[PDB]
Amino acid sequence: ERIRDLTSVQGVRENSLIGYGLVVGLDGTGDQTTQTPFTTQTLNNMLSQLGITVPTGTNMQLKNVAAVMVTASYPPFARQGQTIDVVVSSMGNAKSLRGGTLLMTPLKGVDSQVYALAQGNILVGGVQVNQLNGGRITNGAIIERELPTQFGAGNTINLQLNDEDFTMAQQITDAINRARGYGSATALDARTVQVRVPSGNSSQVRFLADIQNMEVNVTPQDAKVVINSRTGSVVMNREVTLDSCAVAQGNLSVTVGGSLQSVRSSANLNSVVRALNALGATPMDLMSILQSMQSAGCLRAKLEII
Amino acid sequence: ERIRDLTSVQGVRENSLIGYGLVVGLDGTGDQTTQTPFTTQTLNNMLSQLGITVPTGTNMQLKNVAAVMVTASYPPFARQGQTIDVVVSSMGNAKSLRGGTLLMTPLKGVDSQVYALAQGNILVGGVQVNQLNGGRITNGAIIERELPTQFGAGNTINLQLNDEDFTMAQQITDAINRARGYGSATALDARTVQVRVPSGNSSQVRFLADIQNMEVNVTPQDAKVVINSRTGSVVMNREVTLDSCAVAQGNLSVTVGGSLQSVRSSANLNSVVRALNALGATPMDLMSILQSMQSAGCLRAKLEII
Amino acid sequence: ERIRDLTSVQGVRENSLIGYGLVVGLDGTGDQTTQTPFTTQT
Amino acid sequence: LNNMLSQLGITVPTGTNMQLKNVAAVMVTASYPPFARQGQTIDVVVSSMGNAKSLRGGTLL
Amino acid sequence: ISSLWIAKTGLDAQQTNMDVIANNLANVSTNGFKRQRAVFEDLLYQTIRQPPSGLQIGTGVRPVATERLHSQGNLSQTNNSKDVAIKGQGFFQVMLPDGTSAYTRDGSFQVDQNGQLVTAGGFQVQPAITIPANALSITIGRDGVVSVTQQGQAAPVQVGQLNLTTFMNDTGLESIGENLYIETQSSGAPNESTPGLNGAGLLYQGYVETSNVNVAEELVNMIQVQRAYEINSKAVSTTDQMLQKLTQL
Amino acid sequence: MISSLWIAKTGLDAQQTNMDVIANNLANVSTNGFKRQRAVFEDLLYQTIRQPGAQSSEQTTLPSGLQIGTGVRPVATERLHSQGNLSQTNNSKDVAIKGQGFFQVMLPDGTSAYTRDGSFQVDQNGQLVTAGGFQVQPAITIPANALSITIGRDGVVSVTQQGQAAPVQVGQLNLTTFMNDTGLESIGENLYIETQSSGAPNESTPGLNGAGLLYQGYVETSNVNVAEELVNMIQVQRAYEINSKAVSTTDQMLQKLTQL
Amino acid sequence: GAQSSEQTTLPSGLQIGTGVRPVATERLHSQGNLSQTNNSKDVAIKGQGFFQ
């Protein structure tokens, strides 16, 4: 496995930008201005800024516009002239945003600073119906501000591991040391590996490029089972093992001769799957069976509800 | 891959222009002036400017006009006499803008300055019905102002990479150095490459023209999976790998013998696709299966909801 | 059985984080603001 | 729910409808095991307290 | 024999007409019922070839459609703060228990145990309008904004907006009973609009629209139907007796 | 038998139910606190012969397909829970209600009923019972030496002891509000009982939480509109008239068919 | 409206009409006539205003 696929650099980080905007067009299906006062107020503000002052007391019952929230992912090392994708979601009671246009919404960070400007055309999917109150604009946002970074300064760079593991950190450190000079990397904890790099942005970039594509074997992580209970999904790791036990579940019985089916000990995932299948049951019954089995032991893995 | 296809120049940048206007004609289907006060007010303002002063107290119930917002993309190095395309979107309750005409709307930037003038005829598409409240005018806007630029000044030009990557920056720098003289380029971060160019607009233009068409190989980017969840779309990178695991999903069972289908380890995209297809399921079920699998491991890629 | 599968380290520990937020879109099916005052206030 | 909202930073006026149906007040019971360590985890049982119809896919907070 | 079947088709058409008349007369005093009328049509024609260039004998009759008259019924005053009638076009939208949506022009509304506005049978109206637990008076304006009055608070808190839906073809809807219609491919997609704008009607609170059934029309129609039935039976008897005299030899 | 006769039969049954409800409303004038009923009707099956969609040509659509339909099933009877007309009875044991609310009562089974009637009494042990010996809740005991009784408009009940110059507070008579007055199930005796359609009872002192006010010396007359019910009888009678004429027509056609 | 021919117009179209809905019961707040009850506790008002 590549270092880039399971590790992230300390200085490289994403940010969240949020903003308010309006979508025009829509062939009707827009917000009901009677129940969405902010839409009309924002439209009046935009008109006044453009040079049109609508009297305060007016009907202003329009249906071709919808108040929306635009969310964007400020990428690491964002440049002033670059563009990013944005997601536009209806705010009021708009029926749909099929062919709407987002108009010059400022995208700000958590500090209330304008970091981007988003404007463009919304694209939405045209019994599993698509979401017509949420669309995506590709390259719809242009960056405006650049975040200062410490990259290129200092002599140590921290590689951060997703799903921290002491064995994973040790393997990464060993691979880095073997590829580069002696003492090039050192694990600080189960999730952080400090790598010594020469001073200079170019040198650090070259070192990171060399390190990222390195091949490191992935050791057995852990015996983990995931039960959704909301999407009816059960997933088992390759490391899961089953201890010998007997399980009885409602309406389930030996094929043949009755309830209390026996579960043979299984050391590998194939054996575990075969035994569970022999203990015939739907995924919903399997979730309860697994919960009870883990409670009683006989299940050498940790099960988590997602 | 060409440098132009994956990099943008520091000085070259687009801008967003917005403006308010009116569309005439439409064979009816225009805004309901009773519920759209700004349409009648703007029409009265235009008439007064032209030399006709309608009394304040009047019916003015017209249906051949629609108040619209016009959006344009101010291109880099825009010249005074050039023309750009514009997008016109209905603002009030207009039914359609089939054959309307946009009349002399000023397109302004975020600084409230008039940067273009837009006027022309709207073109709109003539069960998947087309958007009749949004049209496009080709060459409908003529530029009026030119943005000052620093291009041609200094000796360094920053190439900005879309979807920053340390390996990508290193490859671009190496290609530039190999093509040009030694030390011609230097990577400053995962997204910026500083290139030394001779002083002078003509020399910089020649250098950029030479650099842009250069061929640079694209290294493996990352194991990324994209799930829309709104358009029912799932996309997997060529770098995605699947770890051995067992998955059980509602109504899904072994073809044959029951639930808890086994997923063999797959190192390449073809193997991953074959294993997932053998684990037969529709895309909606596949999204949940992928989420649970990633939660439990067994999926050597990062999945993002779009 | 592996030590990791049946033992946990003293320093390694998980924590719980909670927060309040809003979800936009939904094609309707959202909260009834009349019966959910906190939604409109937020 | 109002106490939790106020703690998080939202103060709902005392006089309000607040007629919600996606939440249920519950009692959670756990078995503190012998020699329990600070970082360890235990299983819990959640039981409805009021008139909730079901807790099929709920989340304990 | 031939005349027997064609006269039987006549009898069947008259019976369908009487069925429609009976359903109309029975649903009198049903709020929002639209009277139905049967449109008949003649069947194919046999062409006897002449050696004008032929003649046509024809065979019977066929009921081809039933149209519903989507006029405006008389209002009736009910003193009920929840009952609502419609001035002009439009339908209330309700959500069937399975999850799909039907449409009713019937405004005898109630509130269930959770304050939701339901329709005499428990189907939730759309959009979800929930009365506060301590309501004194409920008002529904002509524009559909439903509001309540609380205790001492001298200002109506707006609690919902009761929209209407209008169709390109009123008659194309199929009725699924229980004063409910559901969209068909002949009706086009619903156009969801606030009352009083874009062609939808206004709302009158405390009044229920009655059936637009004209009983004098139906009594005269029953006269016609009974006489036509007897006439077609006369034709059947004539053919039967002709077959007597045919088989006697 | 004949598809016309079943439809007409349902129509007759619906009009008969209408007349039943009318007569119950109409005889229950002069009954204190009574609430008018009104029947809501509802068409039955529609037997589809041609689907309203179901394109005929490759392009046409066959609008408004053929479907016959039956029946007038009465779906419900709602009860109009509006305020009745107060009238001065000038009796100290009679209390009316101005606004929402119901007096709670404990039935001899122990289950709780709810009545909107104030024609109260005092029994041999002194309790406030209600015209049939149904004890009100919470229990209110008149002392044997009490000479006069008053129920404050807020709901406080205080008697005048002998000798003592102070109307001591003997109890608080509280109301109960339901989210759905209409869903109460009437069990007769001017009582209603909780069903899950009405919602849980919310007991409060009068005035608070939307409850009404207690008017001693008044009685709440039934809100039955006599003129409305008279014209309703005219309408229901002539509807029954018409439906029987439809049955006659079907009978005559069918007997001509038998004679055939 | 509803023009029949190209040149005729059909003035005063046919519409039936229904109902006598009572829109309101307006309450007229005029000043009453004051009379000497000669009781100390009974005070009348002269003009606009109400007791809270």
- Distance from C-alpha of F92 to C-alpha of F149, rounded to nearest angstrom: 7
Residue A191's closest CA among A224, A159, A151? A159
- Distance from C-alpha of E87 to C-alpha of E207, rounded to nearest angstrom: 11
CB B203 within 8 A of CB B226: no
CA distance, residue C28 to nearest chain D CA (Å): 16
**CB atoms A91 and C5 under 8 Å:** no
**CB atoms A230 and D43 under 8 Å:** no
Number of H helices, E strands in chain D: 1, 2
- Distance from C-alpha of A277 to C-alpha of A296, rounded to nearest angstrom: 20
| Cis preceding linkage at B55, omega within 30 | no
Specify the DSSP class assigned to residue F93: T
User: Encoding tokens for residue E176?
Assistant: 């699924």
- In sign, the C-alpha dihedral spanning B48, B52, B58, B62 is negative
Strand arrangement of the beta sheet that strand E137-140 belongs to: E137-140, E145-149, E157-161
In this structure, the dihedral spanned by the alpha carbons of residues E225, E229, E235 and E240, taken in order and rounded to 10 degrees, is 170
CB A216 within 8 A of CB A175: yes
User: Encoding tokens for residue D42?
Assistant: 């235990």
CA distance, residue E35 to nearest chain F CA (Å): 11
Distances (CA, A) of B60 to A20, B37, B41, B47, B65: 34, 10, 10, 12, 12
Q: Return the residue of A nearest to B244 by Cα.
A: A238
What are the chain A neighbours of B298 within 8 Å (beta carbons)?
235, 237-238
**CB atoms C20 and D37 under 8 Å:** no
User: Encoding tokens for residue B171?
Assistant: 């490859």
**CB atoms C28 and E127 under 8 Å:** yes
- Distance from C-alpha of F237 to C-alpha of F248, rounded to nearest angstrom: 17
User: Encoding tokens for residue F191?
Assistant: 């009582």
Q: Helix, strand, coil shares of chain D as percentages rounded to 5?
A: 10, 15, 70
B39 interfaces chain A, CB cutoff of 8 Å = no
- F185: amino acid identity, one letter: E
What are the chain G neighbours of E74 within 8 Å (beta carbons)?
18-19
What are the chain D neighbours of A295 within 8 Å (beta carbons)?
43
Alpha helices (H) along F69-166? none
- Distance from C-alpha of E232 to C-alpha of E14, rounded to nearest angstrom: 9
Mind spelling out the 3-state secondary structure of chain A?
Answer: CEHHHHEEECCCCCEEEEEEEEEECCCCCCCCCCCCHHHHHHHHHHHHHHCCCCCCCCCCCCCCEEEEEEEEEECCCCCCCCEEEEEEEECCCCCCCCCCEEEEEEEECCCCCEEEEEEEECECCCCCCCCCCEEEEEEEEEECCCCCCCCCCCCEEEEEECCCCHHHHHHHHHHHHHHCCCCCEEECCCCEEEEECCCCHHHHHHHHHHHHCCECCCCCCCCEEEECCCCCEEEEECCCEECCEEECCCCCCCCCCCCCEEECCECCHHHHHHHHHHCCCCHHHHHHHHHHHHHCCCEECEEEEC
Give strand pairing partners of D48.
Answer: D26
- Distance from C-alpha of A137 to C-alpha of A83, rounded to nearest angstrom: 11
User: Encoding tokens for residue B233?
Assistant: 């779309």
Residue E34's closest CA among E217, E210, E221? E210
C-alpha gyration radius of chain A: 28
CB F249 within 8 A of CB E222: yes
Subunits with 3+ C-beta pairs closer than 8 A to A: B, C, D, E
Out of D10, D40, D41, name the one closest to residue C38 (CB): D10
Buried b (16+ CB within 10 A) or exposed e, B54-73: eeeeeeeeeeebbbbbbbbb
E132 interfaces chain C, CB cutoff of 8 Å = yes
Give me the residue label for tokens 């021919």: G5
Q: Helix, strand, coil shares of chain C as percentages rounded to 5?
A: 20, 0, 80
Q: How many CA atoms lie within 13 A of F180 on its CB side?
A: 24
- Distance from C-alpha of E154 to C-alpha of E44, rounded to nearest angstrom: 71
**Contact: chain A with chain B (3+ CB pairs below 8 Å):** yes
For residue B215, how far is the Cα from the chain centroid?
25
Residue E207's closest CA among E108, E59, E129? E108
Give me the residue label for tokens 């010059």: A104
CB F172 within 8 A of CB F155: yes
- Distance from C-alpha of A93 to C-alpha of A33, rounded to nearest angstrom: 9
Experimental technique of record:
cryo-EM
Distances (CA, A) of F252 to E223, E228, F244: 11, 12, 12
**CB atoms D10 and C42 under 8 Å:** yes
What are the chain A neighbours of E145 within 8 Å (beta carbons)?
34
D39 interfaces chain A, CB cutoff of 8 Å = no
- Distance from C-alpha of B165 to C-alpha of E77, rounded to nearest angstrom: 74
Q: Return the residue of E nearest to G18 by Cα.
A: E74
**CB atoms A103 and B247 under 8 Å:** no
- B14: amino acid identity, one letter: E
CB B301 within 8 A of CB B241: yes
- Distance from C-alpha of A70 to C-alpha of A142, rounded to nearest angstrom: 13
The set of residues, in sequence order, having a beta carbon less than 8 Å from that of B220 and lying 6+ positions away, is A2, A213, B238, B239
Distances (CA, A) of F83 to E231, F86, F96, F105: 59, 9, 10, 20
E115 interfaces chain D, CB cutoff of 8 Å = yes
- Distance from C-alpha of F37 to C-alpha of A255, rounded to nearest angstrom: 61
Give me the residue label for tokens 């139905």: E36
Specify the DSSP class assigned to residue F208: G
- Distance from C-alpha of B12 to C-alpha of A94, rounded to nearest angstrom: 37
Resolution (A): 3.7
- Provide the phi-psi class of F89: left if phi over 0, else alpha when psi is between -120 and 50, else beta: alpha
User: Encoding tokens for residue B278?
Assistant: 């053998």
CB F95 within 8 A of CB E203: no
